[model samples]
Target: FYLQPLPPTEAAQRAKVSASEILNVKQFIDRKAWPSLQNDLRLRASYLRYDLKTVISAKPKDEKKSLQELTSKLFSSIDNLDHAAKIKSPTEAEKYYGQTVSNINEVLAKLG
Candidate 1:
């Protein structure tokens, strides 16, 4: 028996988890707490990337393609944030952080 692609409501809940994480990462960047928090920050963004795919998979079939596109855009911004965190670039991290936030909102709107 296969029970994947959880219900649409469940998928929205899962995406909210990512939304929280997206905001969570901002704190580290906002403080410019580098190296000391860089690894954790990277992992947070990385995990967001990982789970977002799961969220996408859970979308209704009719929504899969649009969700995938949004996820991809979201991933690109996250990658930028990840790289910024890796190098501890406060400016770049902040820049990408905003994009990530916007992308997350867009994805969530579509999910709902």
Candidate 2:
């Protein structure tokens, strides 16, 4: 149900790194970098989910629920982006990417 607890500072830093990868996905979609998009969706984005989990675990108890909520939203946005990528729909990908960006931004705000 949880990951190895990380130091709050390191967890915050890693959270910033992993969470911002959504921007790369957004770039891929914008540039129609289909190959890179697919690769990131398969690899980095997959890592992002777990990274967020670790961050959540590392946060103080009071902060965990809010982090979980944002993380879940971020996960859903990524899932939508993946589906859009599989279907090669830039329109759909753009929509989901916007959602991903906002969710991560909110998470960053909360973390800092």
Poorest lDDT segment (10 consecutive residues) of candidate 1: 1-10
| TM-scores for every predicted model | 0.73, 0.82
lDDT per residue for candidate 1 within 21-110, as digits (tens), equals: 666767788787766345665555555555567766765789789988888898788778878878878889989888988988887787
lDDT of 2 at 111: 75
lDDT of each: 0.71, 0.76
Q: Flag clash pairs in model 2.
A: none
Writing each residue's lDDT as its tens digit, candidate 2 over 1-112 gives: 3345456557677667767665777778988887778787666565666667777887789989988998888788878888888898989888888887888798789776
The CA lDDT at 4 in model 2 is 50
Q: How does candidate 1 fare on TM-score? A: 0.73
